[PDB]
């Protein structure tokens, strides 16, 4: 009925006899206070997945029913904490003091509740903001390579949210716990802790928690989304959540699939990633954008889980160790990367000057092999190569140094309008830095106009400013 007795246990699952009225997905309690989740209802037994240490449970022990589905605490108090996939604090600092709860398995918004994505999510990285823009309500996969700096992309994107009126939720899945603490101390220093709330499920935890962590993060995000806020969610590794679920489903003896994954592994991640939406105004106007991150082992994205997520998301940003060692950092491969919202996720000033930048980069990439023979080329090809070298130089950036969008737009304008093709390719970085200082000193009207109208300033005044700076460059 509402009680039973344990008949088998081990490897983090247990089979129970009884509990006839238990429902799929219900929370369940053993005699020690250890919780479990009823995942398999079969003819005569129940397959229970244990959410703690199982070694205190024996065959013949009682088990009892809680009568409720999985729920998560939600509220402004979680802000600045570190918590479990359940709402439990992990940082010390005492309890969290939430006032309400949210199911882990809420439905995604429908067709009719969405508005098209139309406002940007500024990461502060020139390459991203210019060539692979991200909007609010978008899902973008960041496929890194472990020798490049792939995790700093998400952490710098989160730190850049400080003046943009955004909540964020870092989710660490199957990470080492001293590295999730290194992330917490990094965010703390930034006062980025002060928005960032943080969910962690480290490699030592039971598989079920690692499997629940991304859903708990999204459920904490949706609270603020439906109140009307904009939230950013970073999934540290979905492939590890998939591995945890595969382990559970093999231990419950379900049919195996392509790599021993169950038949609903695609549906798991579809359920997860379709909760990130841009709500329509009748629904409040809030949004939730997701950034799943994946580490490659050489460039191979042909694994089953990476292919699934690639098919589900709206774009992917590619970082390659070949570019990273040849001096190109952040090391984004603009040719292979894609964003399908792009254009709609940019301000007017950027959308004005990014197209020519893209054209110049593509022409340079297709001309690269001719560069070895420069003395022999026609003047058109020499011009193209000269522009490409400078474009690549200006797209470089230093780790943990974000740039405001208006400064990004101004320097890209300077490049694409020909002002920068007098400087030697080795002076381009220094030129950019000194130009930013010059702007700080006396381009305040231009900076303010861009900030206020999201549009390019007057061309004549802009040209005068750029020429004036060149009159003092050396």
């Amino acid at each position: 009925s509402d009680v039973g007795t344990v008949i088998q246990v081990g490897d983090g699952i247990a089979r129970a006899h009884g509990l006839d009225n238990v429902m799929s997905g219900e929370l369940v309690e053993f005699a020690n206070g250890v919780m479990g989740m009823a995942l398999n209802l079969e003819e005569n037994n129940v397959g229970i997945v244990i959410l703690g240490p199982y070694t205190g449970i024996k065959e013949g022990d009682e088990v009892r029913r809680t009568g409720r589905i999985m729920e998560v605490p939600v509220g402004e108090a979680l802000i600045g904490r570190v918590v479990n996939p359940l709402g439990q604090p992990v940082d010390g600092l005492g309890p969290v003091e939430t006032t309400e709860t949210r199911p882990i398995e809420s439905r995604a918004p429908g067709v009719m509740d969405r508005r098209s994505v139309h406002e940007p999510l500024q990461t502060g990285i020139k390459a991203i903001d210019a060539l692979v823009p991200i909007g609010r309500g978008q899902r973008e996969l960041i496929i890194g390579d472990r020798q490049t700096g792939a995790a700093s992309v998400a952490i710098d994107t989160i730190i850049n949210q400080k003046d943009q009126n955004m909540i964020s939720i870092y989710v660490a899945i199957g990470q080492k716990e001293s590295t999730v603490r290194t992330v917490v101390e990094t965010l703390r220093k930034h006062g980025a802790l002060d928005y960032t709330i943080v969910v962690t499920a480290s490699a030592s935890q039971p598989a079920p928690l690692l499997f629940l962590a991304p859903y708990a993060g999204v459920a904490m995000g949706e609270y603020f989304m439906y109140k009307g806020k904009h939230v950013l969610v970073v999934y540290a590794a979905l492939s590890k959540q998939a591995a945890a679920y595969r382990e559970l489903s093999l231990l419950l003896r379900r049919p195996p699939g392509r790599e021993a994954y169950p038949g609903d592994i695609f549906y798991l991640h579809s359920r997860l990633l379709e909760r990130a939406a841009k709500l329509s105004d009748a629904k409040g106007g809030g949004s939730l954008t997701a950034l799943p991150f994946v580490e490659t082992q050489a460039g191979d994205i042909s694994a089953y889980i990476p292919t699934n997520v690639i098919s589900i998301t709206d774009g992917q940003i590619f970082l390659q160790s070949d570019l990273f060692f040849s001096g190109v950092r952040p090391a984004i491969n603009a040719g292979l990367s894609v964003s399908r919202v792009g254009g709609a996720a940019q301000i007017k000033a950027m959308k004005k000057v990014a197209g020519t930048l893209r054209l110049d980069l593509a022409a340079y990439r297709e001309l690269e092999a001719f560069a070895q023979f420069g003395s022999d080329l026609d003047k058109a090809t020499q011009a193209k190569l000269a522009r490409g070298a400078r474009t690549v130089e200006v797209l470089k950036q230093d780790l943990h140094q974000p740039i405001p969008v208006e400064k990004q737009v101004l320097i890209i304008y300077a490049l694409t309008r020909g002002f920068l093709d007098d400087i030697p390719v080795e002076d381009v970085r220094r030129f950019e830095k000194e130009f930013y200082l010059f702007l700080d000193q006396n381009g305040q009207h231009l900076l303010e106009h861009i900030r206020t109208t999201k549009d390019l300033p007057n061309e004549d005044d802009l040209n005068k400013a750029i020429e004036a700076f060149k009159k003092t460059f050396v």
């Binding site: 398999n40 209802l41 589905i69 038949g263 609903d264 549906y267 939406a277 709206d314 026609d378």
Partner: protein, 470 residues
């Protein structure tokens, strides 16, 4: 009277127990409508499809929605037929999910509406038409180089931002204007953001009013993602068989349909076939595709978008799909950047559809000369850039000057394009496009500037555009 009980719940899979003499057929739909008796329970409104008879009066089923909150001993009702969706005029201007319930906010279909089963055998051998018939679309490039067959399967290939959705809405508009056919759009494994975008774009087009539309979202379970294509096909079949007309069916990603089938096979525990696909790959594809044909009283013709899993065309899903294509159409970002819309380059289609019968006398001679001229110009495009600007300029300028005029005359002004630029848009018959290209190949129009040939309808409007620009 027959009603069963839930006995096993294992993810999207549910087992149901029935009395001995009243087991449902193997594709029937089952309903669970439970009201929470106490606070320890939850409301559920799920639908199941029977998949296998296991013995001992139990059946194995697949859920069309989430199975959270189910309880053993819950009561299940057998509807006595496959999923049945509404058909007819009420479907026009609406949006449905797999079960035939509108997911738009514009109300719901009255209970006395007529509803057809989603599962059904293909038309009999005697019922099929005895000969081939070209479907004229009014689009010059297609109707010349890659003519659609009534009852044919056409593969649509292309990149991003090249004009797929504009070409689809223009086909829907031209077919409904010049032939009088409705259409059905069936997105399988749709990103929900892209479904909302497509609905609002198509609404503005008022081609939504012809469009009648079914979506199977990426976040639905595999059974729903498997069957959404069949529900769309049923709504098109109604208009072929009842109204006796030529219909258009668009399937966004046949690959996602096959992938959902593979996931369902893994869930039901069948042994995987080569490259991990379900053993029934070919049978499932054939059952879907063989219901798209031309009969004595109408036809269905399908534009299908096909994803090649690793750019490997020998992979089982692309191979089994390509086994059914009558035609193809590829879109080029190079042409979209050159400003040549529609941006089409549709070569394989020439060989089957065009060549032999219909076009084979007049139109095949014109179309072969167009293809040979554009192929020559591509080879010239490498040498043209440096040397060839001078060296082509006498000998090859005769080819290039005519080839660029042919390349510009293949573009066209679409009705749907009027919202981007103020051009009314035109519908050009097949014999007129055969005529114009024959003239340009004869050199009647060489004195006119190349730009006069761009983004226009019949050949005469080229003369008018040139006369207007000088």
């Amino acid at each position: 009277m027959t009603r069963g009980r839930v006995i096993q719940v294992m993810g999207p899979v549910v087992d149901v127990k029935f009395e001995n003499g009243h087991l449902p057929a193997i594709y029937n739909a089952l309903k669970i409508q439970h009201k929470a008796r106490n606070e320890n329970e939850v409301d559920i409104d799920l639908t199941l499809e029977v998949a296998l008879h296991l013995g001992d009066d139990t059946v194995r089923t697949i859920a069309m929605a989430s199975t959270d909150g189910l309880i053993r001993g819950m009561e299940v009702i057998d509807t006595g037929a496959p999923i049945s969706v509404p058909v007819g005029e009420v479907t026009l201007g609406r949006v449905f999910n797999v079960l035939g319930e509108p997911i738009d906010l514009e109300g719901d279909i009255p209970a006395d509406a007529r509803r057809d089963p989603i599962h059904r055998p293909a038309p009999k051998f005697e019922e099929l038409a005895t000969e081939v018939e070209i479907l004229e679309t009014g689009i010059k490039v297609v109707d010349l180089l890659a003519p659609y067959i009534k009852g044919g399967k056409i593969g649509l290939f292309g990149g991003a931002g090249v004009g797929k959705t504009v070409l689809i809405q223009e086909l829907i508009h031209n077919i409904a204007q010049e032939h009088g056919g409705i259409s059905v759009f069936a997105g399988v494994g749709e990103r929900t953001r892209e479904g909302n975008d497509l609905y609002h774009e198509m609404k503005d087009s008022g081609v939504i009013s012809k469009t009648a539309m079914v979506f199977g979202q990426m976040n639905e379970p595999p059974g729903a993602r498997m069957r959404v294509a069949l529900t769309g096909l049923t709504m098109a079949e109604y208009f072929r068989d009842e109204q006796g007309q030529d219909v258009l069916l668009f399937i966004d990603n046949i690959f996602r349909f096959t992938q959902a089938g593979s996931e369902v096979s893994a869930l039901l525990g069948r042994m995987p076939s080569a490259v991990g696909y379900q053993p029934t790959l070919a049978t499932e594809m054939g059952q879907l595709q063989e219901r798209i044909t031309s009969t004595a009283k109408g036809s269905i013709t399908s534009i299908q978008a096909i994803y090649v899993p690793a750019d490997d065309y020998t992979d089982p899903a692309p191979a089994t799909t390509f086994s059914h294509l009558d035609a193809t159409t590829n879109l080029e970002r190079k042409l979209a950047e050159m400003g040549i819309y529609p941006a089409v380059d549709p070569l394989a289609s020439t060989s089957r559809a065009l060549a032999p019968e219909i076009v084979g006398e007049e139109h095949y001679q014109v179309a072969r000369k167009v293809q040979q001229t554009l192929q020559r110009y591509k080879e010239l495009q490498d040498i043209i850039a440096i040397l060839g600007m001078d060296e082509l300029s006498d000998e090859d300028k005769l080819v290039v000057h005519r080839a660029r005029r042919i390349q510009f005359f293949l573009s066209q002004n679409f009705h749907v394009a009027e919202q981007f630029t103020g051009q009314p848009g035109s519908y050009v018959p097949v014999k007129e496009t055969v005529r114009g290209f024959k003239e340009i190949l004869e050199g009647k129009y060489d004195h006119l500037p190349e730009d006069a040939f761009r983004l226009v309808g019949r050949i005469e409007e080229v003369v008018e555009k040139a006369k207007a620009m000088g």
